[PDB]
């Protein structure tokens, strides 16, 4: 409902969201927006674990708006049982599969409001696999008639597409018992570990659904979703996969799991994937991690 | 409250460790067989900060003090289970601050009994400093009739919120916090550390010091949690000494913030020198980074 200001760094945006947990980023969920000729498809942004639409997209969303897209973002996976779930603005703690249902409702609203046939979708971290749930289980895709898919492009950053070894926690990654973390961390934390039930089910039979064009971006220095290459997808029949290492061609971009959202290079990569025939400017600028290394 | 963790050299790995073992002791600490030597006859008691514990706070300071020849002791205090943050593992000192003095009294008595010593020296990080001052003022850490028999001889602090904080790291967002809505979320300790809070008012009423105590009060120019940083400094009352130290004086490359610099070699030297004035302690000057970029 309220609109917060444009941001350039993740933790300031998070702090703002902790006092305004339902805020929208600039340029987002204007339900009067009409797709243009250059950009027929609305863009749906899907946040990550313990995050919201504001702290995830307070830079990406304004940039996509200035580029001429209609931009939309939901908040999802909200629950109040886990400890972290009780903190303001930490969403997407609920077990992940039903996220696809929430996304479906939202996407229907967006299509309904814009008269477009399809949307494009960007997902951060859990967002990505939440989006894939929608693709696989909740009608994002149409197995019998791929051309009718409601999602045309899935773009993701840091997505835990095949779970994470949590390499950044060092020796502590293995001490995490999948059974004791839900009450504290929330079930989604457990759903993103290696070979979780949800990920075995999500990946059973393949990474892709036909018709969808996937752009899967990872950062070398991501230490939340690890090894970082596990984010990459393998194309199945009738699908396209472009896996991008954020650093190939720009080693001075040191984005991590969080700072990648405020990297001008990542925004460029996203805009490129959204407008492949458009000569998009993909910068190569420095960007730092959140922590000092 | 007796598993011993490894020495650490960075704060966040220590905090992570503690989250899986929230009663861990830093090395060299709470050996109740330890007898103070003649060169260092006072035990050292370490008092942690808000949302912290003895491990993440002193997993560097304690091993270093132990190798310098002190008997080292540390407690966890201010544990409550009503606030949301208070429910997370190893985030202690969320309870309202004043009564922490009482816990410290208990602990100090067990230390004196265990070692035959007349006094202790004490070190406090952030809330630990004013919690320590609570003990000094309201729970018998000082003796008005006979200051010579104060149970505490030295109080050394770092980043202590001795006169409350403006939270300048939050910029204009700090003015947006409502002191009545944060207790349930962050713990009453957070509200007690705000400027002119009831607790700080009663604690500082009538002066910063008690007779017979030597105060070494350290702040860092880059501390942006206990702000303005100079507010930590104390004014000497009657029968008291205050040595107000800015960590960056004589070493502008030490860029420690509120958390790092618990892991600064310079800070550790400063504390060792305050403990051993006549001992020609080496105080290095070395580069140390903030926790964030
Ligand atoms: C150093 C990497 C360790 C693994 C990363 C784990 C935490 C990453 C969280 C990213 C989202 C924003 C953080 C806010 C919620 C913190 C909860 C937590 O620390 O588990
Ligand atoms: C993208 C998936 C991210 C999952 C990361 C979750 C783990 C990161 C570590 C967080 C600190 C450890 C949390 C401690 C909770 C233990 C609770 C318990 O079982 O008692
Ligand atoms: C949902 C209830 C809203 C009321 C406020 C909730 C606060 C959540 C945000 C906290 C940001 C950090 C505030 C830091 C104050 C700590 C004071 C200190 O450590 O000295
Ligand atoms: C969770 C363990 C951390 C212990 C203390 C945490 C401090 C939380 C307070 C945040 C409000 C202050 C604004 C942050 C500025 C960061 C600069 C610094 O750390 O010195
Ligand atoms: C995406 O990753 C798969 C394997 O994980 C690889 O076969 C494929 O070539 C990659 N695609 C691109 C465009 O890099
Ligand atoms: C801090 O202590 C110094 C001595 O180190 C003293 O001269 C000064 O007055 C004190 N500062 C304050 C604000 O009391
Ligand atoms: Ca919630
Ligand atoms: Ca503190």
XYZ file of C-alpha atoms and ligand atoms in Angstrom:
696
model
C 0.000 0.000 0.000
C 2.614 2.635 1.005
C 5.451 3.417 -1.374
C 8.975 3.566 0.029
C 11.904 5.383 -1.595
C 14.389 4.078 -4.123
C 17.471 2.504 -2.499
C 21.015 1.546 -3.520
C 22.018 -0.922 -0.804
C 20.323 -3.936 0.693
C 20.632 -3.335 4.421
C 19.260 0.242 4.390
C 16.271 -1.067 2.370
C 15.821 -3.910 4.830
C 15.882 -1.519 7.778
C 13.271 0.666 6.115
C 11.138 -2.415 5.486
C 11.370 -3.454 9.147
C 9.370 -0.290 9.981
C 7.175 -0.491 6.844
C 6.851 -4.222 6.116
C 4.141 -3.876 3.422
C 5.834 -1.057 1.481
C 6.124 -1.228 -2.252
C 9.311 -0.155 -4.020
C 8.962 2.756 -6.456
C 7.329 2.084 -9.789
C 5.504 -1.015 -8.595
C 1.901 -2.263 -8.498
C 0.499 0.731 -10.333
C -2.651 -1.154 -11.385
C -3.325 1.429 -14.100
C -0.137 0.479 -15.970
C -0.543 -0.720 -19.551
C 2.199 -2.695 -21.339
C 3.816 -0.705 -24.129
C 4.782 -1.685 -27.650
C 8.417 -2.198 -26.697
C 7.548 -4.221 -23.577
C 4.289 -6.142 -24.021
C 4.806 -8.284 -20.928
C 4.429 -7.174 -17.315
C 7.216 -8.126 -14.931
C 6.545 -9.936 -11.645
C 9.274 -9.779 -9.005
C 9.434 -12.537 -6.385
C 11.417 -11.957 -3.172
C 13.621 -14.285 -1.140
C 13.726 -16.010 2.238
C 13.227 -13.669 5.228
C 12.750 -10.750 2.823
C 9.944 -8.763 1.138
C 9.260 -6.928 -2.136
C 10.751 -3.684 -0.857
C 14.127 -4.804 0.436
C 14.551 -7.202 -2.503
C 13.588 -4.771 -5.249
C 14.111 -1.173 -4.086
C 16.725 -0.850 -6.851
C 15.685 -3.414 -9.469
C 12.062 -2.239 -9.579
C 12.700 1.502 -10.225
C 15.276 0.564 -12.879
C 12.812 -1.675 -14.716
C 10.208 1.095 -14.446
C 12.515 3.673 -15.995
C 13.113 1.125 -18.784
C 9.407 1.131 -19.705
C 8.064 -2.041 -18.054
C 4.964 -2.450 -15.952
C 6.344 -3.860 -12.672
C 4.550 -5.886 -9.974
C 5.642 -7.520 -6.733
C 3.815 -9.669 -4.176
C 4.663 -10.693 -0.620
C 4.370 -14.416 -0.029
C 5.097 -17.329 2.308
C 4.017 -15.265 5.316
C 3.519 -17.102 8.626
C 3.675 -16.285 12.335
C 4.635 -19.593 14.016
C 8.407 -19.562 13.481
C 10.499 -17.119 15.527
C 12.009 -15.331 12.524
C 8.543 -15.365 10.943
C 7.402 -13.080 13.754
C 9.875 -10.365 12.782
C 8.535 -7.500 10.641
C 9.153 -7.822 6.903
C 10.678 -11.331 7.038
C 8.357 -13.263 4.691
C 8.715 -16.443 2.615
C 9.370 -18.527 5.723
C 6.400 -20.812 5.084
C 7.083 -24.179 3.443
C 7.755 -23.418 -0.177
C 5.539 -25.486 -2.522
C 2.281 -23.573 -1.742
C 4.119 -20.348 -2.707
C 3.227 -21.363 -6.262
C -0.435 -20.905 -5.403
C 0.066 -17.376 -4.088
C 2.122 -16.429 -7.163
C -0.649 -17.852 -9.370
C -3.318 -15.624 -7.803
C -1.029 -12.611 -8.189
C -0.136 -13.413 -11.758
C -3.817 -13.751 -12.595
C -4.437 -10.276 -11.182
C -1.560 -8.895 -13.254
C -2.707 -10.486 -16.480
C -6.232 -9.446 -15.738
C -5.221 -5.867 -15.072
C -3.010 -5.426 -18.123
C -4.772 -7.458 -20.779
C -1.508 -9.217 -21.598
C -1.276 -12.894 -22.462
C 1.914 -13.591 -20.496
C 4.170 -12.202 -17.820
C 7.902 -12.327 -17.307
C 9.109 -13.256 -13.817
C 12.257 -12.500 -11.810
C 13.005 -14.420 -8.623
C 15.634 -13.864 -5.941
C 16.890 -16.931 -4.060
C 13.793 -18.696 -2.716
C 11.798 -16.549 -5.146
C 13.332 -18.533 -7.999
C 12.260 -21.943 -6.733
C 8.969 -20.446 -5.573
C 8.469 -19.336 -9.160
C 9.311 -22.817 -10.380
C 6.647 -24.263 -8.095
C 4.157 -22.008 -9.864
C 5.591 -23.239 -13.183
C 5.332 -26.917 -12.300
C 2.294 -27.265 -10.022
C 0.066 -24.190 -10.111
C -0.525 -23.361 -13.784
C 2.402 -21.114 -14.645
C 2.951 -23.588 -17.514
C 0.583 -25.531 -19.835
C 1.939 -29.016 -20.560
C -0.484 -29.746 -23.411
C 0.026 -26.392 -25.202
C 3.349 -24.785 -24.246
C 2.601 -21.680 -26.325
C -0.153 -20.879 -23.800
C 2.200 -20.680 -20.762
C 1.347 -17.740 -18.550
C 5.060 -17.155 -17.821
C 7.333 -16.528 -20.788
C 10.694 -15.763 -19.080
C 11.896 -16.896 -15.660
C 14.993 -14.947 -14.590
C 16.638 -15.775 -11.265
C 19.512 -14.640 -9.079
C 21.058 -16.824 -6.410
C 18.195 -19.273 -6.711
C 18.613 -22.408 -4.616
C 17.543 -24.438 -7.620
C 19.167 -27.650 -6.282
C 19.445 -26.757 -2.583
C 22.522 -25.340 -0.850
C 25.473 -26.694 1.132
C 25.526 -23.353 3.017
C 29.278 -23.177 2.504
C 29.436 -19.729 4.163
C 28.483 -21.219 7.554
C 31.623 -23.374 7.359
C 31.667 -26.336 9.716
C 28.244 -25.266 10.977
C 26.349 -26.139 7.763
C 26.429 -29.831 8.701
C 25.299 -29.198 12.281
C 21.937 -27.907 11.024
C 19.292 -30.559 11.835
C 16.423 -30.233 9.284
C 14.024 -31.059 12.109
C 14.873 -28.386 14.675
C 15.221 -25.325 12.418
C 11.569 -24.878 11.270
C 10.365 -23.573 14.667
C 13.191 -20.980 14.713
C 14.117 -20.339 11.054
C 10.834 -21.344 9.381
C 10.092 -24.362 7.186
C 11.495 -22.687 4.054
C 15.006 -22.762 5.450
C 14.642 -26.536 5.691
C 13.036 -26.785 2.216
C 16.183 -25.323 0.623
C 18.712 -27.805 2.029
C 20.252 -30.434 -0.259
C 17.835 -33.244 -1.149
C 15.018 -31.770 0.890
C 11.689 -33.436 0.123
C 10.462 -30.315 -1.629
C 13.509 -30.029 -3.854
C 13.481 -33.709 -4.812
C 9.812 -33.251 -5.778
C 10.400 -29.931 -7.573
C 13.305 -31.347 -9.603
C 11.852 -34.847 -10.203
C 11.722 -35.406 -13.949
C 13.749 -32.351 -14.918
C 14.707 -28.735 -14.353
C 12.442 -27.134 -16.947
C 8.931 -26.976 -18.368
C 8.534 -26.647 -22.155
C 8.137 -23.193 -23.608
C 9.756 -21.245 -20.777
C 12.946 -19.246 -21.404
C 15.169 -19.452 -18.299
C 17.983 -17.006 -17.469
C 19.718 -18.327 -14.361
C 22.250 -15.910 -12.827
C 24.722 -16.815 -10.112
C 27.552 -14.977 -8.369
C 30.865 -16.699 -7.656
C 30.985 -14.976 -4.279
C 27.482 -16.080 -3.327
C 27.943 -17.969 -0.070
C 24.301 -18.585 0.801
C 23.307 -20.678 -2.239
C 26.299 -22.961 -2.666
C 28.188 -24.182 -4.484
C 27.035 -21.254 -6.620
C 26.973 -23.337 -9.822
C 24.186 -25.466 -8.363
C 21.861 -22.568 -9.218
C 22.347 -23.379 -12.921
C 19.663 -25.344 -14.778
C 19.764 -28.063 -17.444
C 17.393 -27.437 -20.367
C 14.813 -30.099 -21.081
C 12.763 -30.540 -24.237
C 11.166 -27.367 -25.540
C 12.980 -25.132 -23.052
C 15.877 -22.713 -23.150
C 18.430 -22.142 -20.418
C 20.988 -19.350 -20.306
C 23.127 -19.696 -17.149
C 25.123 -16.566 -16.409
C 27.964 -16.182 -13.943
C 27.618 -12.532 -12.911
C 31.419 -12.142 -13.037
C 32.194 -13.540 -16.531
C 33.336 -10.389 -18.308
C 33.403 -8.261 -15.151
C 35.587 -9.694 -12.409
C 35.409 -6.417 -10.441
C 31.721 -7.046 -9.659
C 31.950 -8.752 -6.256
C 28.203 -9.067 -5.592
C 27.224 -11.556 -2.943
C 23.881 -13.256 -2.261
C 22.467 -9.882 -1.144
C 24.471 -7.130 -2.841
C 23.800 -8.619 -6.290
C 20.324 -7.100 -5.993
C 21.957 -3.641 -5.942
C 24.487 -4.334 -8.706
C 24.100 -2.256 -11.861
C 25.496 -5.262 -13.757
C 22.726 -7.581 -12.554
C 20.056 -5.030 -13.436
C 21.644 -4.880 -16.857
C 21.605 -8.649 -17.223
C 17.915 -8.706 -16.227
C 17.014 -5.904 -18.695
C 18.916 -7.769 -21.413
C 17.019 -10.974 -20.757
C 13.738 -8.991 -20.777
C 14.502 -7.251 -24.082
C 16.852 -9.535 -26.037
C 16.597 -7.489 -29.307
C 17.191 -4.146 -27.614
C 20.922 -3.371 -27.344
C 20.783 -3.207 -23.569
C 23.647 -1.590 -21.646
C 25.150 -4.247 -19.367
C 27.616 -2.227 -17.277
C 30.746 -3.547 -15.636
C 31.131 -1.513 -12.448
C 32.586 -2.375 -9.045
C 30.181 -3.693 -6.443
C 31.046 -4.873 -2.996
C 29.819 -7.662 -0.732
C 27.658 -6.828 2.231
C 30.386 -7.949 4.667
C 34.038 -6.927 4.682
C 36.324 -9.754 3.575
C 26.868 -23.578 30.171
C 30.253 -25.384 30.176
C 31.035 -26.492 26.576
C 34.191 -24.683 25.481
C 34.307 -23.293 21.951
C 37.313 -22.518 19.756
C 39.194 -19.260 19.673
C 37.837 -16.949 16.980
C 39.388 -13.952 15.209
C 36.223 -12.497 13.635
C 32.887 -11.632 15.239
C 30.364 -13.113 12.838
C 31.848 -16.637 12.683
C 31.812 -16.508 16.488
C 28.168 -15.455 16.558
C 27.257 -18.246 14.136
C 29.121 -20.759 16.280
C 27.253 -19.527 19.347
C 23.867 -19.885 17.617
C 24.354 -23.666 17.642
C 25.999 -23.701 21.107
C 24.582 -20.658 22.912
C 26.102 -21.584 26.309
C 29.615 -22.027 24.909
C 32.492 -20.538 26.825
C 35.308 -18.790 24.973
C 38.631 -20.554 25.628
C 40.513 -19.906 28.841
C 37.351 -18.923 30.698
C 35.525 -20.112 33.833
C 38.202 -22.502 35.015
C 37.094 -22.550 38.614
C 40.448 -24.071 39.592
C 42.306 -20.918 38.503
C 44.270 -19.065 41.185
C 45.291 -15.488 40.347
C 49.057 -15.019 40.279
C 50.915 -12.359 42.216
C 51.630 -10.399 39.029
C 47.889 -10.335 38.191
C 45.977 -10.897 41.436
C 42.574 -9.679 40.271
C 40.316 -12.000 38.255
C 38.850 -10.468 35.069
C 35.083 -10.654 34.494
C 33.771 -10.214 30.938
C 30.241 -8.812 30.422
C 28.726 -9.193 26.936
C 26.447 -6.868 24.969
C 22.882 -6.771 23.711
C 21.669 -9.774 21.678
C 25.120 -11.284 22.351
C 26.786 -13.796 24.691
C 30.106 -14.525 26.360
C 31.270 -16.552 23.356
C 30.713 -14.253 20.388
C 31.824 -11.283 22.492
C 35.043 -12.650 23.968
C 36.194 -15.531 21.748
C 39.257 -13.387 20.979
C 39.561 -11.170 24.059
C 39.363 -14.016 26.567
C 42.079 -16.324 25.101
C 44.358 -13.293 24.833
C 43.717 -12.252 28.443
C 44.263 -15.877 29.512
C 47.622 -15.999 27.735
C 48.561 -12.699 29.406
C 48.197 -14.535 32.718
C 44.793 -13.584 34.137
C 42.104 -15.776 35.613
C 39.204 -15.018 33.234
C 35.477 -15.344 33.985
C 32.344 -14.608 31.953
C 28.584 -14.969 32.396
C 25.478 -14.893 30.252
C 22.828 -12.522 31.610
C 19.582 -10.732 30.795
C 18.050 -13.823 29.217
C 14.292 -13.601 28.699
C 11.907 -15.483 26.428
C 9.055 -13.036 25.791
C 10.525 -10.803 23.060
C 10.925 -12.130 19.539
C 14.698 -11.592 19.403
C 14.879 -12.940 22.958
C 13.740 -16.265 21.528
C 16.640 -16.681 19.285
C 19.544 -18.898 20.377
C 22.357 -17.046 22.130
C 20.846 -13.539 21.902
C 21.051 -12.665 25.582
C 20.884 -9.360 27.510
C 17.425 -8.586 26.119
C 15.888 -8.211 29.568
C 15.547 -4.767 31.078
C 19.001 -3.715 32.106
C 18.984 -2.678 35.824
C 18.463 -6.197 37.254
C 21.512 -7.375 35.253
C 23.584 -5.827 38.034
C 22.073 -8.414 40.343
C 23.115 -11.301 38.109
C 26.584 -9.773 37.895
C 26.714 -9.555 41.692
C 25.923 -13.259 41.950
C 28.605 -14.062 39.391
C 31.202 -11.814 40.993
C 30.600 -13.399 44.384
C 31.196 -16.890 42.966
C 34.388 -15.559 41.410
C 35.696 -14.040 44.631
C 34.798 -17.165 46.634
C 36.493 -19.367 44.033
C 39.798 -17.463 43.919
C 40.337 -15.974 47.373
C 40.679 -12.570 45.717
C 39.593 -9.275 47.238
C 38.535 -7.569 44.018
C 37.815 -8.215 40.363
C 38.518 -6.194 37.277
C 35.688 -5.984 34.787
C 35.258 -5.435 31.050
C 31.963 -4.565 29.388
C 31.005 -4.485 25.711
C 28.091 -2.126 24.854
C 25.229 -2.890 27.271
C 27.760 -4.813 29.390
C 29.357 -1.521 30.390
C 26.200 0.014 31.819
C 25.027 -3.347 33.168
C 28.388 -3.268 34.940
C 27.646 0.231 36.156
C 24.284 -1.044 37.407
C 26.166 -3.575 39.548
C 28.486 -0.810 40.740
C 25.632 1.477 41.796
C 22.669 -0.677 42.808
C 24.034 -4.120 43.732
C 27.172 -3.752 45.822
C 29.976 -3.701 43.277
C 31.086 -0.600 45.140
C 31.180 0.233 48.844
C 30.430 3.818 49.886
C 31.526 3.429 53.527
C 34.890 2.050 52.399
C 35.725 2.487 48.702
C 39.028 0.699 49.326
C 36.962 -2.497 49.658
C 35.032 -2.057 46.395
C 34.556 -5.526 44.925
C 35.419 -3.978 41.529
C 38.666 -2.080 41.033
C 38.783 -1.427 37.272
C 35.884 -1.041 34.896
C 37.039 -1.146 31.254
C 34.420 -0.696 28.532
C 34.152 -0.603 24.771
C 31.321 1.094 22.917
C 29.332 1.207 26.158
C 26.077 3.158 25.808
C 26.900 5.051 28.987
C 24.648 8.009 28.112
C 22.374 6.402 25.545
C 22.655 6.345 21.781
C 21.153 8.251 18.838
C 21.591 5.234 16.528
C 23.164 7.476 13.917
C 23.837 4.395 11.808
C 20.079 4.336 11.213
C 20.129 7.912 9.946
C 16.696 9.540 9.869
C 15.083 6.130 10.423
C 16.019 6.339 14.126
C 13.495 9.129 14.691
C 10.894 6.672 13.398
C 11.347 4.018 16.083
C 8.635 4.163 18.758
C 10.147 3.305 22.187
C 6.903 1.631 23.253
C 6.745 -0.814 20.322
C 10.311 -2.171 20.366
C 10.323 -4.081 23.728
C 8.100 -6.916 22.426
C 10.247 -7.234 19.283
C 13.829 -6.348 20.263
C 13.726 -6.674 24.056
C 13.430 -4.019 26.758
C 17.249 -3.605 26.764
C 16.992 -1.856 23.408
C 14.596 0.762 24.776
C 16.650 1.146 27.958
C 19.659 2.140 25.838
C 17.834 5.051 24.183
C 18.570 8.653 25.133
C 16.928 9.704 28.417
C 15.348 6.315 28.977
C 14.155 5.794 32.566
C 16.971 3.320 33.219
C 19.782 5.538 31.949
C 18.256 8.491 33.803
C 18.318 6.677 37.145
C 21.770 5.207 36.464
C 23.422 8.522 35.608
C 21.494 10.516 38.242
C 24.110 12.194 40.392
C 27.171 11.386 38.283
C 28.885 8.754 36.103
C 31.159 7.220 38.765
C 31.439 5.728 42.259
C 34.383 6.423 44.615
C 37.367 4.114 44.331
C 36.788 2.830 40.801
C 39.271 3.240 37.946
C 37.392 3.663 34.646
C 38.968 3.006 31.222
C 36.321 3.931 28.649
C 37.114 3.125 25.011
C 35.160 4.285 21.991
C 35.792 4.119 18.275
C 35.213 6.990 15.865
C 33.502 4.494 13.557
C 31.235 2.998 16.203
C 27.867 3.750 14.665
C 25.648 1.888 17.099
C 26.615 3.751 20.313
C 26.419 7.277 18.944
C 27.580 9.869 18.948
C 30.576 7.741 19.953
C 31.867 10.364 22.437
C 28.736 9.827 24.514
C 30.343 6.684 25.913
C 32.994 8.782 27.681
C 32.631 9.371 31.430
C 33.296 12.322 33.725
C 35.261 11.494 36.861
C 33.459 11.935 40.158
C 35.038 12.212 43.612
C 37.472 9.418 44.434
C 37.255 8.067 40.877
C 39.545 8.137 37.858
C 38.438 8.142 34.249
C 40.677 7.451 31.261
C 38.598 8.194 28.131
C 40.286 6.564 25.118
C 39.477 6.932 21.417
C 40.704 3.748 19.749
C 41.888 5.693 16.690
C 44.157 8.112 18.572
C 47.662 7.126 17.532
C 46.350 4.684 14.891
C 43.974 6.071 12.309
C 44.096 2.835 10.277
C 42.181 0.911 12.980
C 38.687 1.251 11.528
C 36.906 -1.009 14.028
C 33.169 -0.519 14.379
C 30.865 -1.414 17.281
C 31.344 -5.164 16.687
C 34.726 -5.660 15.035
C 37.484 -4.539 17.263
C 36.095 -6.817 19.798
C 38.499 -8.555 17.376
C 41.058 -5.722 17.104
C 44.569 -6.490 18.339
C 44.887 -2.821 19.262
C 41.785 -2.954 21.474
C 43.083 -6.092 23.172
C 46.361 -4.320 23.873
C 44.466 -1.332 25.274
C 42.591 -3.615 27.678
C 45.784 -5.442 28.673
C 47.493 -2.121 29.343
C 44.594 -0.932 31.486
C 44.899 -4.178 33.445
C 48.696 -3.904 33.793
C 49.661 -0.208 33.905
C 53.224 -0.862 35.083
C 53.804 -3.686 32.590
C 54.968 -1.865 29.427
C 52.210 -3.561 27.420
C 52.589 -3.537 23.644
C 49.669 -1.786 21.980
C 49.897 -2.562 18.258
C 48.674 -0.299 15.528
C 47.265 -2.424 12.725
C 44.508 -2.177 10.107
C 41.125 -3.516 11.181
C 37.965 -3.358 9.110
C 34.320 -2.723 9.944
C 31.924 -5.642 9.787
C 30.087 -4.209 6.770
C 31.556 -2.732 3.619
C 27.768 -15.993 5.542
C 26.687 -16.819 4.852
C 25.923 -17.680 5.857
C 24.637 -18.262 5.264
C 23.629 -17.134 5.008
C 22.480 -17.306 5.991
C 21.662 -16.006 6.138
C 21.391 -15.317 4.801
C 20.130 -14.461 4.859
C 19.776 -13.606 3.865
C 18.506 -12.732 3.912
C 18.537 -11.515 4.859
C 18.931 -11.879 6.297
C 17.819 -11.588 7.311
C 17.389 -12.830 8.118
C 18.567 -13.514 8.866
C 18.250 -14.948 9.335
C 19.503 -15.824 9.484
O 20.618 -15.276 9.803
O 19.416 -17.090 9.269
C 18.479 -20.088 0.986
C 18.405 -21.081 2.145
C 19.049 -20.482 3.394
C 18.994 -21.383 4.626
C 19.968 -20.834 5.682
C 19.578 -21.304 7.090
C 20.776 -21.565 8.026
C 21.689 -20.346 8.180
C 22.248 -20.279 9.604
C 21.614 -19.563 10.533
C 22.195 -19.514 11.917
C 21.884 -20.862 12.563
C 20.423 -20.870 13.023
C 20.332 -21.531 14.381
C 18.938 -22.072 14.610
C 19.024 -23.417 15.326
C 17.641 -23.709 15.908
C 17.589 -25.069 16.594
O 17.487 -26.138 15.883
O 17.652 -25.057 17.857
C 6.456 -4.537 14.587
C 6.679 -3.502 15.684
C 7.323 -2.207 15.183
C 8.126 -1.524 16.278
C 9.603 -1.454 15.920
C 10.203 -2.801 15.509
C 11.717 -2.639 15.385
C 12.368 -3.517 14.325
C 13.594 -2.808 13.783
C 14.726 -2.662 14.481
C 15.911 -1.941 13.866
C 17.119 -1.898 14.800
C 16.893 -1.025 16.040
C 18.162 -0.932 16.896
C 17.926 -0.397 18.307
C 18.895 -1.090 19.252
C 19.412 -0.171 20.358
C 20.814 -0.566 20.819
O 21.327 -1.645 20.458
O 21.448 0.206 21.566
C 22.999 -9.657 16.335
C 24.349 -9.386 16.989
C 24.768 -7.926 16.837
C 25.103 -7.260 18.173
C 24.898 -5.753 18.022
C 24.051 -5.527 16.766
C 23.704 -4.062 16.514
C 22.291 -3.879 15.944
C 21.978 -2.400 15.865
C 21.689 -1.803 14.716
C 21.396 -0.325 14.714
C 22.698 0.453 14.514
C 22.977 0.757 13.041
C 23.984 -0.198 12.405
C 25.295 0.500 12.032
C 26.445 -0.506 11.844
C 27.858 0.015 12.152
C 28.465 -0.760 13.312
O 28.185 -2.003 13.456
O 29.223 -0.108 14.085
C 23.358 -24.036 -18.605
O 23.854 -25.058 -17.755
C 23.883 -26.333 -18.389
C 24.376 -27.385 -17.386
O 24.158 -27.017 -16.013
C 24.753 -26.286 -19.659
O 24.696 -27.533 -20.364
C 24.322 -25.190 -20.628
O 25.214 -25.078 -21.757
C 24.229 -23.880 -19.869
N 23.715 -22.883 -20.799
C 24.337 -21.747 -21.147
C 23.678 -20.917 -22.207
O 25.384 -21.376 -20.645
C 37.317 11.768 29.484
O 38.458 11.529 30.296
C 39.480 12.472 29.999
C 40.807 11.883 30.444
O 41.066 10.752 29.592
C 39.084 13.778 30.668
O 40.132 14.767 30.581
C 37.787 14.216 29.989
O 37.210 15.313 30.702
C 36.740 13.096 29.954
N 35.662 13.445 29.056
C 34.458 13.726 29.530
C 33.414 14.040 28.505
O 34.225 13.734 30.723
Ca 5.437 -13.762 9.153
Ca 25.637 -3.429 21.306
